[PDB]
């Protein structure tokens, strides 16, 4: 079928739920509390309160 | 924790109009306030000449 690891043809995005960052196993990044979760890029949620 | 995790999860407001029909208008209004006296004037007129029998058989 077609590879998606040649021929662009990406799916499974909607599949991530969060990623984070961290430098020197210290500083998260970008921290300064710029986002509404500043530690992580929380990309979807289950629940939202 | 999984599984089906990966999509997601009053008082009165109180209306008026309900279910009754249209409604219209017109503006060529209202003779009806004559007859009121029409009516209580021949009325009278009625009374009056009963009497006219009763202060002729009485003479």
Known sequence: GSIPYLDGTFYLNHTFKKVSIMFDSSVSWPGNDRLLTP?????KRSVDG | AAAAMTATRMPSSGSSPSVPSSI??????LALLAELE???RQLA???????????????
């Open chain 2, 38 to 40: 029409a009516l209580s």
């Open chain 1, 39 to 43: 530690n992580e890029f929380e990309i």
């Open chain 2, 24 to 29: 219209i208008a017109e503006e060529k209004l």
């Open chain 2, 45 to 59: 007129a009625l009374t009056q000449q009963v009497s006219e029998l009763r202060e002729q058989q009485q003479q």
